[PDB]
Amino acid sequence: HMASLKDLEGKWRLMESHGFEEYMKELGVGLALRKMAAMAKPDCIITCDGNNITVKTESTVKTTVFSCNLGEKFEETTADGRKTETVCTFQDGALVQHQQWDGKESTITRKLKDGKMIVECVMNNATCTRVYEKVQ
């Protein structure tokens, strides 16, 4: 019943979002791009080649890809344009993506619950939950 990293592999579509505006505010995202991101309703394509993890976020506005090895720190350029130092780990059934930039930090965790991918984003007191389902 506990997920593995491979369970996250696939093409996922955003079905539900809560607290995303508030989270993007904490990250520093301005109004215009916030509204653009809120209307964007993307896919998230995840591939897991062993512990080589690739996460592709695809929308009609912008597409982002990072590809990493689990537990090895890497430089990420985020969709909002932050340059972070990021490490992905796998903890209690969740992919945990920790970003640090300018002495700030945020965590994005992705986990399978009840066949859906639950993506929880935290920065300071701001939390966002996004629900994805698998494209058939």
Ligand X SMILES: CCCCCCCCCCCCCCCCCCCC(=O)OC(CO)CO
Footprint on this chain of ligand X (rule: CB under 6 A): 24, 29, 33, 36-37, 40, 42, 44, 55, 57, 59, 61-62, 78-80, 108, 110, 119, 121, 130
Q: How many residues bind a copy of itself (CB under 8 A)?
A: 15
Contact characters 62-81, Cl ion, x per CB under 5 A = ---------------x----
CB of 5 to a copy of itself, least distance (A): 15
Contacted entry of ligand X, Cl ion, a copy of itself, none for residue 90, CB cut-off 5 to 8 Å set by kind = none
Sign of CA dihedral 90, 107, 34, 75: negative
Cα–Cα distance for residue pair 116/12, rounded to 1 Å: 9
131 a known binding residue?
Answer: yes
Both tokens of 132, joined, read: 């994805």
Residue 127 touching a copy of itself (CB under 8 A):
no
Contact characters 33-52, a copy of itself, x per CB under 8 A = --------------x-x--x
Which helix (DSSP H) or strand (DSSP E) does residue 8 occupy? Answer: none
Q: Quick one: which of 91, 94, 90, 101 has its CA closest to 120?
A: 94
Cα distance between the two ends of the chain:
22
**Which amino acid, one-letter code, is at 95?**
L
